[PDB]
Design a protein around this ligand. Structure first.
Ligand SMILES: [Cl-]
Ligand SMILES: [Cl-]
Ligand SMILES: [Cl-]
Length: 163
């Protein structure tokens, strides 16, 4: 575990993370995809061997000794708000299980279902709060990656509020 487990947020490409493992915002079929998923595919393409896994689940594949945790959030274009919310909470709980199993001291994580899976809605708070529900009981240092300046400010504020 980390000496004093923390939450941080960085505005940069998760493919250049400084953590012991990464969470991919994966699709269920293990395809290269776009956004985070495409950056992860370019950096760790070996990790997409048998990475296909259902919505609401996480599947880890090694790239050398570096773990890639393929987390499949729901596409809110396809799910109702109610059912999408259940599956988004589930994917984060499976991430917490994998991070614990691997014994890592840090993890890089994107906000699942906030990009092309958002169904055109702002899901910062929804996705962030499910991340906390899952990861609060783990002792890994969590580093949340985003791309938007206003999102970085809002995520930083949400972290500080709890402290
Ligand atoms: Cl960057
Ligand atoms: Cl997404
Ligand atoms: Cl973002």
């Amino acid at each position: 575990g980390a000496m004093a487990p923390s939450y941080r947020v960085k505005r940069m490409d998760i493919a250049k993370n400084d953590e012991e493992c990464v969470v991919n915002a994966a699709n269920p079929r293990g395809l290269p995809g776009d956004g985070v998923c495409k950056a992860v595919y370019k950096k760790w393409p070996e990790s997409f061997k048998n990475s296909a896994t259902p919505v609401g689940t996480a599947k880890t594949v090694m790239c050398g000794t570096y773990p890639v945790i393929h987390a499949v959030g729901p596409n809110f274009s396809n799910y109702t708000e109610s059912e999408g919310d259940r599956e988004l909470a589930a994917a984060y709980r499976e991430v917490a299980k994998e991070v614990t199993r691997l014994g890592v001291n840090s993890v890089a994580i994107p906000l699942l279902s906030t990009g092309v899976y958002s169904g055109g809605k702002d899901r910062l708070t929804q996705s962030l709060n499910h991340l906390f529900t899952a990861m609060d009981s783990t002792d890994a240092d969590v580093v949340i990656y985003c791309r938007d300046k206003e999102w970085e400010k809002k995520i930083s504020e949400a972290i500080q509020m709890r402290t």
